[PDB]
RNA sequence: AUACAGUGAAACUGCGAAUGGCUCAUUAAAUCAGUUAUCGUUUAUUUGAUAGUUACAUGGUAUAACUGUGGUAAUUCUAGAGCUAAUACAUGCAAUCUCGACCCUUUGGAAGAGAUGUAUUUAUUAGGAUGAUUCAUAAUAACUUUUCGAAUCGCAUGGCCUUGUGCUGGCGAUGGUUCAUUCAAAUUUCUGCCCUAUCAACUUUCGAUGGUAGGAUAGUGGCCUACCAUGGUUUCAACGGGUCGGGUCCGGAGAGGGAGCCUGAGAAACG
């Protein structure tokens, strides 16, 4: 079942780790 | 990029084989040809040797064969209805071999009136379901060719227990 | 007119109930143009695999038309042949009309009828002036040429034999279907 | 700027250097393939029409048709192989060093080096039908007499040179066609005879 | 190598050519042709290292380009043309005709023949099948495709090919008591009579051969070439008659 | 039989409904050779198997082996065991060795864990299946 | 040599550049050594067979070399003009064989009836070879952005007459459809001497094992994908750890880094 990725795997993936950085300012509205 | 080499897979015991060598040209694969209904649109592919493979990216007409009556006519393909391997090919209306499509029945209807002079009688008798489809205006057919290889969408009309089983699945 | 798109245009433009099919109101004006165009394509000599397919396609679109138009197409084929004098008189052929050129036109006419009989079969529309009269006049011409002409005209005799052989084939078919 | 003007009917071409910026201005903002009136350029060009065809900038890079800019850009050029190379835009501007023009139509006055002078075609027709077209020969006429001959003199020696007619009907070609047809006939006949002998052998065996 | 080879080192050349080991570093690589690479004798070797008629490759090239050498009744100009078993080589100027036959040692022997014996060759029918338009044909060992063969002819039979027309003159069936030439294995070049043909479906058939001295030896069927019925071979044999 | 998303049929074997000559669906078969008897259950059966050597598009050629069935827990495939004695010269001694061979088994055969099977080589059916059961005993 | 004709730079076409050479970092059935299959595939070339289905020869929808004008600091950098060819690029054209009355003449003529490419795709029908085939092969109906079926060249100028350069022609070259053959390539069956348990579980943690169907492949094949089954190896040692191959030759790789493409029969190209 888990084969072919059909089951969701939450283990960290190094290549995509820190692919982007969050904006601290947040959404435009308060 | 696509490759067919079996070295990358695990051995029968389950060991992880090491990357033996770089990818070779004699073990290549090419991207799939997602044939979709529309204006005919094909481009050649120069394959190993001097041979050429036609990629049917788009197609809307095909030769379909009534096997029981042993005749063949060129007809428009209405749309995909049921595909055994994956359903989402039905949703996007993708054409590949074994896909069941709906084809215009008009040329077969005209030919049948021509040959039998009926809209002698015993021979004219045909399965009830096929006559019902003729009344509907669309015929369930199975594509026999491989649109991703030969550039054609040739096939045949479902009949008999073929038609019964596929109608049940529908 | 374009050769490459000829086939796909037929299955789209002329297919009955087709989305791109001509409107019933526009059938009267357009169809005379269509019949003439196909008549030109039907005279292509079938020397190759593709050329044979084009001829069959031209004849295979006919059932899609309405019956009056089918008669119109047949009338065009017989128009060049002059047969009115033959039936007008007591079934007497003119020597002047008896030529290699006249036989060639007859063979072209008969070939169209033979193909059209195959596709339409029982539904073929048969009319005296349009088909049967020119068809009869052709077979009479073959007999007259065969007997009158000397053995020297080996080509003309051969062509006459072909027309008779095709002419009798045509008559055998038209009785069988209609 | 320098203007390289060519008269194609002549085949002639000459360069005119320009100093005043006002004819250069009427040339500004135009595009390759457009037309300009010579009278704006100068009285010497009064009544003329120039079609812009090409040119080069102060850095020597050529302009290319189809690109709409007044500046240079690295464009992917072709004729199989394709190279990213710098090219000027097709918009005429002050950045252009030399501008090439073709005289579409002639004005009132005649240019000294262009409308007065000719440069003959370097070579004449070689294919037979091209000879017939050039001289308008009838079919009955034989092209062999009308072929263009150029005289060549070496010191005191002198002799005529003429091209070799291609696509000419000559007995050799008729012979070749006849031989091909006869060869096909002979092969067919031999094959039929072989088939007949094979059938006879089977008949004897049975 | 990433494609077809074109060079053949001397030490890697077949042993039976008997090439001098000190002459150089390369040997003639037989071009593609009727015969296999390992079972062929290129014309350069035959003309230079066997007949000694040429002193170097250039002289062989001159000899051929004069159009003096005929291989099976047809002029050949390729120095490395692969002449092979039952091949007829004609030199008209020297009034010499040769047929290539393995001696008892197993190397190609210079065997002079009469012109009448040069007018034909022998071919083992390697395959029989129907071609296009339903015309039966036979493929022999030397690659000749002969159409309209005799129906009786079957695989492993041997046909008599006239060179001028390339047609079958007669044929010999494969049977016990027939005279056979060994064209491979350890017994190459020996001559004998068939005694019994063992058959193993899905495997290599074996045959027993008895020589005139009554010694017996077994060989695979592929390496047998029928040359006639006992005591009446259809070709001239080399000296010794393939004994021992 | 028709227990799959796609229909199962012997390819290019046509059954004309209009003529309706025979009640039995037309069935195609061949004999594998090497003296291996084609069973009747294949001939008048009703299964569909593309990899059956007697009814499928497969041919038996090459080596023919024998073994003991060790597993039959799959759909139409099994694992057999071939034993032998490997000789080490250094200790001049034999040691018992075994190899597990996966094999395709046609549904026309019935096989239990323990019986002896003779199998024939065929074109690669899967990642590991290169053989096909051809005689059960 | 009044079209050219000897020789011939340049340029366009054709072929070749995947051979040869060189170094050993890698990897312990991965390659490899022996052995087997392709009824599971592609193959330039060689060799042998093989295509009767405006024409006294079509176009520039064409350019190089070449002539001539220039830009730039400048390159195997450049644009504008003007020519001209093909085995380049396009287009393209009154016959044979069956059954044979008359049984006329008894080889024979013969009225009449008929039949007549290849290539791709599908459907359907028949089916000499091998142990074995849905094999070879043949036929039917259609399909094609779909082919191919000499608009080519050298040497020579013979035989007929109906004197027109009328008809009919000898030896070669280069092409081309399919099959076979050869050079090869690709997978593939079985077997194959180190120490190890102080390496006992491993695979299934983006297929692991198998079926059905499709996509891709030159093809077979979880090679990739959708659905479904729960498996495969191992105490007779799986899994793990340590330590160029065989015999100058035969194998095996690799030549700024990594990714992506391209032609060609052959490369993931030393381009
Ligand atoms: Mg400057
Ligand atoms: Mg090449
Ligand atoms: Mg599959």
From Swiss-Prot, chain A:
<comment type="function">
    <text>Involved in endoplasmic reticulum to Golgi transport. Involved in a protein-transport step blocked by brefeldin A, which disrupts the Golgi apparatus and its incoming protein flux. May also be involved for mass growth or cell proliferation.</text>
</comment>
<comment type="similarity">
    <text>Belongs to the AATF family.</text>
</comment>
<protein>
    <recommendedName>
        <fullName>Protein BFR2</fullName>
    </recommendedName>
</protein>
UniProtKB/Swiss-Prot annotation, chain B:
<dbReference type="InterPro" id="IPR022309">
    <property type="entry name" value="Ribosomal_Se8/biogenesis_NSA2"/>
</dbReference>
<feature type="modified residue" description="Phosphoserine">
    <location>
        <position position="68"/>
    </location>
</feature>
<feature type="modified residue" description="Phosphoserine">
    <location>
        <position position="72"/>
    </location>
</feature>
<feature type="modified residue" description="Phosphoserine">
    <location>
        <position position="132"/>
    </location>
</feature>
<dbReference type="GO" id="GO:0005829">
    <property type="term" value="C:cytosol"/>
</dbReference>
<comment type="subunit">
    <text>Component of the small ribosomal subunit (SSU). Mature yeast ribosomes consist of a small (40S) and a large (60S) subunit. The 40S small subunit contains 1 molecule of ribosomal RNA (18S rRNA) and 33 different proteins (encoded by 57 genes). The large 60S subunit contains 3 rRNA molecules (25S, 5.8S and 5S rRNA) and 46 different proteins (encoded by 81 genes).</text>
</comment>
<feature type="modified residue" description="Phosphoserine">
    <location>
        <position position="85"/>
    </location>
</feature>
<dbReference type="GO" id="GO:0003735">
    <property type="term" value="F:structural constituent of ribosome"/>
</dbReference>
<dbReference type="Pfam" id="PF01201">
    <property type="entry name" value="Ribosomal_S8e"/>
</dbReference>
<keyword id="KW-0687">Ribonucleoprotein</keyword>
<keyword id="KW-0689">Ribosomal protein</keyword>
<comment type="similarity">
    <text>Belongs to the eukaryotic ribosomal protein eS8 family.</text>
</comment>
Swiss-Prot record, chain C:
<comment type="function">
    <text>Involved in nucleolar processing of pre-18S ribosomal RNA and ribosome assembly.</text>
</comment>
<comment type="similarity">
    <text>Belongs to the UTP20 family.</text>
</comment>
<protein>
    <recommendedName>
        <fullName>U3 small nucleolar RNA-associated protein 20</fullName>
    </recommendedName>
</protein>
<comment type="subunit">
    <text>Interacts with snoRNA U3. Interacts with MPP10. Component of the ribosomal small subunit (SSU) processome composed of at least 40 protein subunits and snoRNA U3.</text>
</comment>
UniProtKB/Swiss-Prot annotation, chain E:
<feature type="domain" description="S4 RNA-binding">
    <location>
        <begin position="41"/>
        <end position="104"/>
    </location>
</feature>
<dbReference type="InterPro" id="IPR013845">
    <property type="entry name" value="Ribosomal_eS4_central_region"/>
</dbReference>
<dbReference type="InterPro" id="IPR018199">
    <property type="entry name" value="Ribosomal_eS4_N_CS"/>
</dbReference>
<dbReference type="GO" id="GO:0003723">
    <property type="term" value="F:RNA binding"/>
</dbReference>
<feature type="modified residue" description="Phosphoserine">
    <location>
        <position position="31"/>
    </location>
</feature>
<dbReference type="InterPro" id="IPR002942">
    <property type="entry name" value="S4_RNA-bd"/>
</dbReference>
<dbReference type="InterPro" id="IPR014722">
    <property type="entry name" value="Rib_uL2_dom2"/>
</dbReference>
<feature type="cross-link" description="Glycyl lysine isopeptide (Lys-Gly) (interchain with G-Cter in ubiquitin)">
    <location>
        <position position="160"/>
    </location>
</feature>
<protein>
    <recommendedName>
        <fullName>Small ribosomal subunit protein eS4A</fullName>
    </recommendedName>
</protein>
<dbReference type="GO" id="GO:0005829">
    <property type="term" value="C:cytosol"/>
</dbReference>
<dbReference type="GO" id="GO:0005737">
    <property type="term" value="C:cytoplasm"/>
</dbReference>
<feature type="cross-link" description="Glycyl lysine isopeptide (Lys-Gly) (interchain with G-Cter in ubiquitin)">
    <location>
        <position position="167"/>
    </location>
</feature>
């Amino acid at each position: 079942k888990a084969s072919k990725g059909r089951k969701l795997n939450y283990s960290v993936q190094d290549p995509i780790a820190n692919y982007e950085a969050p904006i601290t300012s947040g959404y435009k509205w308060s | 990029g696509i490759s067919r080499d079996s070295r990358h897979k695990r051995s029968a015991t389950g060991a992880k084989r090491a990357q033996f060598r770089k990818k070779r040209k004699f073990e290549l694969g090419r991207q799939p040809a997602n044939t979709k209904i529309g204006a005919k649109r094909i481009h050649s592919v120069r394959t190993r040797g001097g041979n050429k493979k036609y990629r049917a990216l788009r197609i809307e007409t095909g030769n379909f064969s009534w096997a029981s009556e042993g005749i063949s006519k060129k007809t428009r393909i209405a749309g995909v209805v049921y595909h055994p391997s994956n359903n989402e090919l039905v949703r996007t209306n993708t054409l590949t071999k074994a896909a069941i499509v709906q084809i215009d029945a008009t040329p077969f209807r005209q030919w049948f009136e021509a040959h039998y002079g009926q809209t002698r009688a015993a021979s004219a008798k045909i399965e009830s379901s096929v006559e019902s489809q003729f009344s509907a205006g669309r015929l369930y057919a199975c594509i026999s060719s491989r649109p991703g290889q030969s550039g054609r969408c040739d096939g045949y009309i479902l009949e008999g227990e073929e038609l019964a089983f596929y109608l049940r699945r529908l | 007119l374009d050769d490459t798109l000829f086939k796909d245009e037929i299955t789209t433009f002329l297919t009955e109930n087709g989305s791109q099919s001509i409107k019933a109101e526009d059938e009267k004006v357009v169809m005379p143009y269509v019949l003439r165009i196909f008549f030109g394509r039907a005279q292509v000599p079938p020397t190759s695999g593709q050329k044979r397919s084009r001829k069959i396609a031209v004849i295979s679109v006919l059932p899609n038309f309405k019956k009056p138009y089918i008669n119109d197409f047949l009338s065009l084929a017989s128009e060049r042949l002059d047969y009115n004098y033959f039936f007008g008189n007591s079934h007497q052929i003119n020597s002047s009309k008896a030529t290699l050129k006249t036989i060639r036109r007859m063979t072209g006419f008969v070939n169209i009828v033979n193909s059209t009989l195959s596709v339409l079969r029982t539904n073929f529309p048969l009319h005296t002036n349009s088909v049967l009269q020119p068809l009869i006049y052709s077979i009479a011409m073959a007999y007259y040429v065969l007997d009158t002409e000397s053995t020297e005209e080996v080509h003309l005799r051969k062509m006459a034999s072909n027309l008779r052989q095709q002419g009798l084939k045509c008559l055998s078919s038209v009785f069988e279907f209609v | 700027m320098k203007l390289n003007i060519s008269y194609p009917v002549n085949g002639s071409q000459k360069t005119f250097e320009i100093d005043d910026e006002h004819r250069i201005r009427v040339f500004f903002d135009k595009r390759i393939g457009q037309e300009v009136d010579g009278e704006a350029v100068g009285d010497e060009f009064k009544g003329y029409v120039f079609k812009i065809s090409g040119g080069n900038d102060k850095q020597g890079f050529p302009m290319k048709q189809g690109v709409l800019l007044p500046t240079r850009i690295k464009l992917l050029l072709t004729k199989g192989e394709r190279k990213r190379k710098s090219v000027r835009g097709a918009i005429v501007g002050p950045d252009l060093a030399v501008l090439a023009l073709v005289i579409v139509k002639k004005g009132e006055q005649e240019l000294e080096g262009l409308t007065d002078t000719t440069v003959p075609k370097r070579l004449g027709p070689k294919r037979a039908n091209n000879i017939r077209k050039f001289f308008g020969l009838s079919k009955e006429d034989d092209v062999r007499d009308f072929v263009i001959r150029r005289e060549v003199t070496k010191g005191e020696k002198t002799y005529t040179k003429a091209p070799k007619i291609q696509r000419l009907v000559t007995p050799q070609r008729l012979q070749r066609k006849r031989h091909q047809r006869a060869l096909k006939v002979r092969n067919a006949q031999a094959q039929r005879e072989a088939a007949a002998e094979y059938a006879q052998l089977l008949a004897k065996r049975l | 190598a990433r494609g077809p080879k074109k060079h053949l080192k001397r030490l890697a050349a077949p042993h039976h050519w008997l090439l001098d080991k000190l002459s150089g570093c390369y040997a003639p690589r037989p071009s593609a042709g009727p015969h296999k690479l390992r079972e062929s004798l290129p014309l350069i070797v035959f003309l230079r290292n066997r007949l000694k008629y040429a002193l170097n490759g250039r002289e062989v090239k001159a000899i051929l380009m004069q159009r003096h050498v005929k291989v099976d009744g047809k002029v050949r100009t390729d120095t490395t043309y692969p002449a092979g078993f039952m091949d007829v080589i004609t030199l008209d100027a020297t009034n010499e005709n040769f047929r290539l036959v393995y001696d008892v040692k197993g190397r190609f022997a210079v065997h002079r023949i009469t012109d009448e014996e040069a007018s034909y060759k022998l071919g083992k029918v390697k395959k029989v099948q129907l071609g296009k338009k339903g015309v039966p044909y036979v493929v022999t060992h030397d690659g000749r495709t002969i159409r309209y063969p005799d129906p009786n002819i079957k695989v492993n039979d041997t046909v008599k090919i006239d060179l001028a027309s390339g047609k079958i003159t007669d044929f010999i069936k494969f049977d016990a008591g027939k005279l056979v030439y060994v064209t491979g294995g350890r017994n190459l070049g020996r001559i004998g009579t068939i005694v019994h043909k063992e058959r193993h479906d899905g495997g290599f058939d074996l045959v027993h051969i008895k020589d005139s001295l009554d010694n017996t030896f077994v060989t695979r069927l592929n390496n047998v070439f029928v040359i006639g019925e006992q005591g009446k071979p259809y070709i001239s044999l080399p000296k010794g008659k393939g004994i021992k | 039989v028709q227990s799959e998303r796609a229909f199962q049929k012997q390819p290019h074997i046509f059954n004309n409904p209009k003529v309706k000559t025979s009640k039995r669906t037309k069935r195609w078969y061949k004999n594998a050779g090497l003296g291996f008897k084609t069973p009747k259950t294949a001939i008048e059966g009703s299964y569909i198997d593309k990899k059956c050597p007697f009814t499928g598009l497969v041919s038996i050629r090459g080596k023919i082996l024998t073994g003991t069935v060790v597993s039959t827990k799959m759909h139409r495939t099994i694992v057999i065991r071939r034993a032998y004695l490997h000789y080490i010269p250094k200790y001049n001694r034999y040691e018992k060795r075994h190899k597990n061979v996966p094999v395709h088994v046609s549904p026309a055969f019935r096989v239990q864990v323990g019986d002896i099977v003779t199998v024939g080589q065929c074109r690669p059916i899967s990642k590991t299946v290169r053989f096909n059961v051809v005689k059960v005993s």
